[PDB]
Amino acid sequence: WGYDDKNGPEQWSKLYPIANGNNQSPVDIKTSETKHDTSLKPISVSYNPATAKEIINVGHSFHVNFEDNDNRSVLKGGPFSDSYRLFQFHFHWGSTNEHGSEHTVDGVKYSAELHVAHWNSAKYSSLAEAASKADGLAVIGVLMKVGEANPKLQKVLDALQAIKTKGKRAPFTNFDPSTLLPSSLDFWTYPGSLTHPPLYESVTWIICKESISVSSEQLAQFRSLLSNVEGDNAVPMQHNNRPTQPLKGRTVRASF
Ligand SMILES: CCOC(=O)C1=C(C)NC(=O)N[C@H]1c1ccc(S(N)(=O)=O)cc1
Numbered sequence: 001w002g003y004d005d006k007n008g009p010e011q012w013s014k015l016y017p018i019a020n021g022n023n024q025s026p027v028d029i030k031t032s033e034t035k036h037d038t039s040l041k042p043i044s045v046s047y048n049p050a051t052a053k054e055i056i057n058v059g060h061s062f063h064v065n066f067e068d069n070d071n072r073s074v075l076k077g078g079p080f081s082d083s084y085r086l087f088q089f090h091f092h093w094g095s096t097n098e099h100g101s102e103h104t105v106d107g108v109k110y111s112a113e114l115h116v117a118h119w120n121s122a123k124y125s126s127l128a129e130a131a132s133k134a135d136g137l138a139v140i141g142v143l144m145k146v147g148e149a150n151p152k153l154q155k156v157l158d159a160l161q162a163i164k165t166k167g168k169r170a171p172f173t174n175f176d177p178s179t180l181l182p183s184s185l186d187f188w189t190y191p192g193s194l195t196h197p198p199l200y201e202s203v204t205w206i207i208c209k210e211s212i213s214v215s216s217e218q219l220a221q222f223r224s225l226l227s228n229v230e231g232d233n234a235v236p237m238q239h240n241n242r243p244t245q246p247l248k249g250r251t252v253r254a255s256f
């Protein structure tokens with residue numbers, strides 16, 4: 001699977017039928033149709049920079065992975081009673097500045113999107129166990145709006161020169177990804193899925209109301225990453241965003 005016309009989102013359903021499920025992500029958030037929910041607690045993140053482990057080129061994207069052997073780095077509050085353990089962050093982007101976000105807000109497409117992914121360590125003993133369970137994953141989505149260079153991205157962008165081609169990986173240490181989040185943690189939440197195969201309907205989405213910035217040149221760095229292995233013909237990673245999917249009558253709740 002990939003993002004090409006042949007192996008891309010519109011074809012995913014052939015091998016992964018859950019693509020046509022009732023809890024697929026991402027979605028268009030219609031602000032007129034959101035339900036303000038008084039029970040929602042503030043989102044609480046507490047990440048230890050010592051849990052940062054590795055940056056990896058996975059061909060369709062790059063990931064920054066965290067040591068997840070204990071509760072040093074955790075998400076709490078919002079719609080959750082359980083504590084969720086940080087394991088990864090990554091981005092999505094588009095071929096142009098005009099699209100690239102996965103979530104949209106009232107039809108508006110942002111240039112990119114940050115995903116900070118966590119697993120339910122109260123109920124489950126590993127990411128592998130948690131990953132397929134309705135209450136297994138919690139992902140914070142931050143919409144990224146093209147404008148001023150974002151200095152908080154600096155360590156991440158500087159690391160890409162070491163993982164230019166598929167499969168390449170490097171230590172990525174001493175980094176707290178709560179530095180990338182907007183200063184307001186007002187959010188939307190809805191029950192949904194991983195936005196690429198295997199598309200498990202295991203994610204509680206936390207979508208920040210406030211966007212963070214990214215420059216056109218910072219976006220060019222993401223797209224200058226190569227999907228091919230070293231020595232092969234260069235194939236830029238131009239985009240990796242899934243189209244919005246039907247709500248099929250789910251409710252997006254607002255903390256605000
Ligand atoms: C069984 C593992 O479970 C997962 O969590 C992931 C899988 C299979 N694939 C990845 O490459 N990384 C993880 C992932 C996390 C968040 C999103 S997203 N984009 O935030 O929905 C996708 C994949």
Ligand SMILES: [Zn+2]
Pocket residue numbers: 090091092115195
């Ligand atoms: Zn993602």
